[PDB]
Motif scaffolding. Structure first.
Motif, PDB file in Angstrom:
ATOM      1  N   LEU A  53       0.846  -1.208   0.000  1.00  0.00           N
ATOM      2  CA  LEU A  53       0.000   0.000   0.000  1.00  0.00           C
ATOM      3  C   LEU A  53       0.885   1.263   0.000  1.00  0.00           C
ATOM      4  O   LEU A  53       0.660   2.221  -0.782  1.00  0.00           O
ATOM      5  CB  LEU A  53      -0.961   0.011   1.205  1.00  0.00           C
ATOM      6  N   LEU A  54       1.908   1.292   0.869  1.00  0.00           N
ATOM      7  CA  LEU A  54       2.795   2.470   0.952  1.00  0.00           C
ATOM      8  C   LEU A  54       3.581   2.666  -0.358  1.00  0.00           C
ATOM      9  O   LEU A  54       3.654   3.793  -0.896  1.00  0.00           O
ATOM     10  CB  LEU A  54       3.761   2.320   2.152  1.00  0.00           C
ATOM     11  N   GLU A  55       4.180   1.588  -0.883  1.00  0.00           N
ATOM     12  CA  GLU A  55       5.027   1.700  -2.078  1.00  0.00           C
ATOM     13  C   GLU A  55       4.228   2.127  -3.317  1.00  0.00           C
ATOM     14  O   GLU A  55       4.792   2.783  -4.218  1.00  0.00           O
ATOM     15  CB  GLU A  55       5.758   0.378  -2.370  1.00  0.00           C
ATOM     16  N   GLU A  56       2.948   1.757  -3.397  1.00  0.00           N
ATOM     17  CA  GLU A  56       2.167   1.935  -4.638  1.00  0.00           C
ATOM     18  C   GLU A  56       1.238   3.160  -4.632  1.00  0.00           C
ATOM     19  O   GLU A  56       0.927   3.699  -5.715  1.00  0.00           O
ATOM     20  CB  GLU A  56       1.414   0.627  -4.947  1.00  0.00           C
ATOM     21  N   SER A  57       0.775   3.568  -3.436  1.00  0.00           N
ATOM     22  CA  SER A  57      -0.151   4.708  -3.290  1.00  0.00           C
ATOM     23  C   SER A  57       0.372   5.872  -2.453  1.00  0.00           C
ATOM     24  O   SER A  57      -0.255   6.948  -2.449  1.00  0.00           O
ATOM     25  CB  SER A  57      -1.476   4.260  -2.653  1.00  0.00           C
ATOM     26  N   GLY A  58       1.431   5.652  -1.661  1.00  0.00           N
ATOM     27  CA  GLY A  58       1.919   6.653  -0.706  1.00  0.00           C
ATOM     28  C   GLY A  58       1.226   6.652   0.660  1.00  0.00           C
ATOM     29  O   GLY A  58       1.646   7.414   1.557  1.00  0.00           O
ATOM     30  N   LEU A  59       0.182   5.832   0.844  1.00  0.00           N
ATOM     31  CA  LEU A  59      -0.628   5.833   2.064  1.00  0.00           C
ATOM     32  C   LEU A  59      -0.157   4.802   3.105  1.00  0.00           C
ATOM     33  O   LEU A  59       0.359   3.719   2.758  1.00  0.00           O
ATOM     34  CB  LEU A  59      -2.106   5.526   1.743  1.00  0.00           C
ATOM     35  N   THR A  60      -0.437   5.132   4.376  1.00  0.00           N
ATOM     36  CA  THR A  60      -0.403   4.149   5.459  1.00  0.00           C
ATOM     37  C   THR A  60      -1.765   4.156   6.180  1.00  0.00           C
ATOM     38  O   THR A  60      -2.625   5.027   5.909  1.00  0.00           O
ATOM     39  CB  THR A  60       0.793   4.374   6.434  1.00  0.00           C
ATOM     40  N   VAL A  61      -1.955   3.179   7.068  1.00  0.00           N
ATOM     41  CA  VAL A  61      -3.195   3.067   7.839  1.00  0.00           C
ATOM     42  C   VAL A  61      -2.863   2.674   9.283  1.00  0.00           C
ATOM     43  O   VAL A  61      -1.795   2.092   9.559  1.00  0.00           O
ATOM     44  CB  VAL A  61      -4.193   2.051   7.220  1.00  0.00           C
ATOM     45  N   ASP A  62      -3.790   2.994  10.195  1.00  0.00           N
ATOM     46  CA  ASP A  62      -3.721   2.504  11.583  1.00  0.00           C
ATOM     47  C   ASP A  62      -4.495   1.179  11.677  1.00  0.00           C
ATOM     48  O   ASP A  62      -3.903   0.125  11.479  1.00  0.00           O
ATOM     49  CB  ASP A  62      -4.145   3.599  12.569  1.00  0.00           C
ATOM     50  N   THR A  63      -5.809   1.196  11.875  1.00  0.00           N
ATOM     51  CA  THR A  63      -6.595  -0.047  11.870  1.00  0.00           C
ATOM     52  C   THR A  63      -6.767  -0.608  10.444  1.00  0.00           C
ATOM     53  O   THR A  63      -7.203   0.104   9.533  1.00  0.00           O
ATOM     54  CB  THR A  63      -7.966   0.196  12.525  1.00  0.00           C
ATOM     55  N   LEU A  64      -6.447  -1.894  10.274  1.00  0.00           N
ATOM     56  CA  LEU A  64      -6.638  -2.606   9.010  1.00  0.00           C
ATOM     57  C   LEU A  64      -7.426  -3.891   9.274  1.00  0.00           C
ATOM     58  O   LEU A  64      -7.016  -4.689  10.112  1.00  0.00           O
ATOM     59  CB  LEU A  64      -5.275  -2.904   8.379  1.00  0.00           C
ATOM     60  N   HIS A  65      -8.559  -4.090   8.581  1.00  0.00           N
ATOM     61  CA  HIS A  65      -9.430  -5.250   8.787  1.00  0.00           C
ATOM     62  C   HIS A  65      -9.199  -6.328   7.723  1.00  0.00           C
ATOM     63  O   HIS A  65      -9.229  -6.029   6.527  1.00  0.00           O
ATOM     64  CB  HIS A  65     -10.904  -4.803   8.712  1.00  0.00           C
ATOM     65  N   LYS A  66      -9.005  -7.569   8.145  1.00  0.00           N
ATOM     66  CA  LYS A  66      -9.000  -8.648   7.184  1.00  0.00           C
ATOM     67  C   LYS A  66     -10.451  -8.980   6.818  1.00  0.00           C
ATOM     68  O   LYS A  66     -11.311  -9.150   7.713  1.00  0.00           O
ATOM     69  CB  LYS A  66      -8.291  -9.874   7.693  1.00  0.00           C
ATOM     70  N   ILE A  67     -10.743  -9.002   5.517  1.00  0.00           N
ATOM     71  CA  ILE A  67     -12.132  -9.199   5.069  1.00  0.00           C
ATOM     72  C   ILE A  67     -12.328 -10.389   4.137  1.00  0.00           C
ATOM     73  O   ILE A  67     -13.465 -10.872   4.033  1.00  0.00           O
ATOM     74  CB  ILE A  67     -12.749  -7.918   4.419  1.00  0.00           C
ATOM     75  N   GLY A  68     -11.303 -10.857   3.416  1.00  0.00           N
ATOM     76  CA  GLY A  68     -11.536 -11.894   2.419  1.00  0.00           C
ATOM     77  C   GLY A  68     -10.342 -12.772   2.150  1.00  0.00           C
ATOM     78  O   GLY A  68      -9.165 -12.373   2.349  1.00  0.00           O
ATOM     79  N   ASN A  69     -10.629 -13.975   1.644  1.00  0.00           N
ATOM     80  CA  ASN A  69      -9.584 -14.861   1.093  1.00  0.00           C
ATOM     81  C   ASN A  69     -10.178 -15.497  -0.159  1.00  0.00           C
ATOM     82  O   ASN A  69     -11.200 -16.196  -0.060  1.00  0.00           O
ATOM     83  CB  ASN A  69      -9.167 -15.913   2.144  1.00  0.00           C
ATOM     84  N   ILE A  70      -9.567 -15.232  -1.319  1.00  0.00           N
ATOM     85  CA  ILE A  70     -10.029 -15.790  -2.592  1.00  0.00           C
ATOM     86  C   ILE A  70      -8.846 -16.518  -3.254  1.00  0.00           C
ATOM     87  O   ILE A  70      -7.766 -15.933  -3.428  1.00  0.00           O
ATOM     88  CB  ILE A  70     -10.672 -14.723  -3.543  1.00  0.00           C
ATOM     89  N   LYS A  71      -9.094 -17.780  -3.626  1.00  0.00           N
ATOM     90  CA  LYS A  71      -8.119 -18.614  -4.346  1.00  0.00           C
ATOM     91  C   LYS A  71      -8.394 -18.546  -5.858  1.00  0.00           C
ATOM     92  O   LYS A  71      -9.568 -18.652  -6.271  1.00  0.00           O
ATOM     93  CB  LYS A  71      -8.216 -20.062  -3.856  1.00  0.00           C
ATOM     94  N   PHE A  72      -7.342 -18.380  -6.667  1.00  0.00           N
ATOM     95  CA  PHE A  72      -7.459 -18.325  -8.131  1.00  0.00           C
ATOM     96  C   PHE A  72      -6.638 -19.435  -8.793  1.00  0.00           C
ATOM     97  O   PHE A  72      -5.419 -19.568  -8.529  1.00  0.00           O
ATOM     98  CB  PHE A  72      -6.995 -16.962  -8.686  1.00  0.00           C
ATOM     99  N   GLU A  73      -7.298 -20.184  -9.682  1.00  0.00           N
ATOM    100  CA  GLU A  73      -6.682 -21.230 -10.500  1.00  0.00           C
ATOM    101  C   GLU A  73      -6.796 -20.810 -11.966  1.00  0.00           C
ATOM    102  O   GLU A  73      -7.908 -20.550 -12.433  1.00  0.00           O
ATOM    103  CB  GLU A  73      -7.375 -22.586 -10.254  1.00  0.00           C
ATOM    104  N   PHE A  74      -5.674 -20.711 -12.672  1.00  0.00           N
ATOM    105  CA  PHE A  74      -5.664 -20.424 -14.112  1.00  0.00           C
ATOM    106  C   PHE A  74      -5.404 -21.733 -14.873  1.00  0.00           C
ATOM    107  O   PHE A  74      -4.436 -22.443 -14.594  1.00  0.00           O
ATOM    108  CB  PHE A  74      -4.601 -19.363 -14.453  1.00  0.00           C
TER     109      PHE A  74
END
Ligand SMILES: COc1nc(N)nc2c1ncn2[C@H]1C[C@H](O)[C@@H](COP(=O)(O)O)O1
Ligand SMILES: [Ca+2]
Ligand SMILES: [Ca+2]
Ligand SMILES: [Ca+2]
Ligand SMILES: [Cl-]
Length: 156
Positions: A53-74
């Motif tokens: 997030l920091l390297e790509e947008s310049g932003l940081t955060v305090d609270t961060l919520h885990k919301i999802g896990n998605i598996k991808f098969e190609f």
């Protein structure tokens, strides 16, 4: 699928809008997306998500919520992509363009799903309701979904 690769994805939201970035190079170039990448040995998944997030947008955060896990098969690959998805309701700093991504805020009615990965439109409504979810998608190339599972859950 014989092996796995961990990946992260971070969505920053405010009332009525979501921060996306245009991917300017590499995997998924030309698609709007959240921010994220791989997990180096010695990092936790959350630490790696915060780094990209920091390297790509310049932003940081305090609270961060885990919301999802998605598996991808190609089809044609033997490596599974195991994507860990996080939501932030507040942020620190101001977004800025990097060589890798150009951040832009979108109102809910303007989210550009036709220029995003095909899965996103199916789980974004869960994300906006502050829900948690598990999923699996099988892709034929980058733009056809051939199999799909998705469920709301209480815990991850
Ligand atoms: C297939 O459907 C998909 N759908 C969505 N919404 N995101 C996907 C995705 N496959 C990968 N990613 C995300 C994970 C990472 O944030 C970034 C790759 O990490 P880098 O190559 O930048 O290091 O792209
Ligand atoms: Ca990235
Ligand atoms: Ca990168
Ligand atoms: Ca990086
Ligand atoms: Cl690249």
């Amino acid at each position: 699928m014989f092996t796995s690769k961990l990946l992260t994805l971070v969505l920053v939201v405010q009332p009525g809008r979501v921060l996306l970035g245009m991917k300017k190079r590499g995997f998924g170039a030309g698609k709007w997306n959240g921010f994220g990448g791989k997990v180096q040995t010695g990092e936790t998944i959350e630490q790696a998500a915060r780094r990209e997030l920091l390297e790509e947008s310049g932003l940081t955060v305090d609270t961060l919520h885990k919301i999802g896990n998605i598996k991808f098969e190609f089809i044609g690959e033997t490596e599974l992509m195991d994507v860990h998805i996080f939501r932030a309701d507040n942020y620190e700093g101001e977004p800025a363009e990097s060589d890798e991504m150009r951040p832009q805020w979108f109102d809910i009615d303007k989210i550009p799903f036709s220029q995003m990965w095909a899965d996103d439109i199916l789980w974004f409504p869960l994300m906006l309701q502050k829900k948690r979810f598990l999923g699996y998608f099988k892709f034929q190339g980058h733009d056809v979904i051939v199999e799909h599972k998705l469920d709301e859950v209480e815990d991850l």
